Design a protein around this ligand. Structure first.
Ligand code: A1B03
Ligand code: ZN
Length: 140
């Protein structure tokens, strides 16, 4: 579990969104596994605006932050899971590292701020839903 809290937005994995998220919806995209809902209080996270390929992510199944090298956001094929059928998840970055359901939500961050959240992984893999192209998260 986990979210990004930037401005009056809460960024979560679409597959983990609650009823309150859907009832206060700003934007959602199934192909990216992302959903954004509105918040009453202002958040403290800042979004990175960059093309970094090295950063650090939080792994809840280890209680640890790990430094990683990651690929650029791409259309990577994701295996059928209980949440989506086999399809091209878009805007996805891969790195070598542990992940278990449970781990989706953990933040990946670079020197500029938050880059994205955990969304894929297994066999020493860990996918990250990028958010750096969502410029509107910084305004309204
Ligand atoms: C089987 C895929 S996985 O990488 O563990 N993961 C499970 C939860 C959903 C993830 C997604 N982003 O589609 C895929
Ligand atoms: Zn960066």
């Amino acid at each position: 579990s986990g979210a990004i809290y930037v401005g009056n937005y809460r960024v979560v994995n679409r597959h983990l969104a609650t009823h309150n998220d859907w009832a206060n919806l700003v934007w959602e995209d199934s192909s990216r596994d992302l959903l954004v809902s509105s918040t009453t209080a202002q958040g403290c996270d800042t979004i990175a605006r960059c093309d970094c390929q090295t950063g650090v992510y939080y792994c809840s199944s280890r209680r640890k932050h790990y430094p990683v090298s990651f690929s650029k956001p791409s259309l990577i094929f994701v295996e059928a899971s209980e949440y989506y059928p086999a399809r091209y998840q878009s805007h996805l970055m891969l790195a070598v590292g542990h992940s278990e359901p449970g781990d989706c939500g953990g933040i990946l961050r670079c020197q500029h701020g938050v880059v994205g959240i955990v969304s894929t992984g297994g066999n020493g893999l860990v996918g990250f839903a990028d958010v750096r192209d969502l410029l509107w998260l910084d305004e309204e």
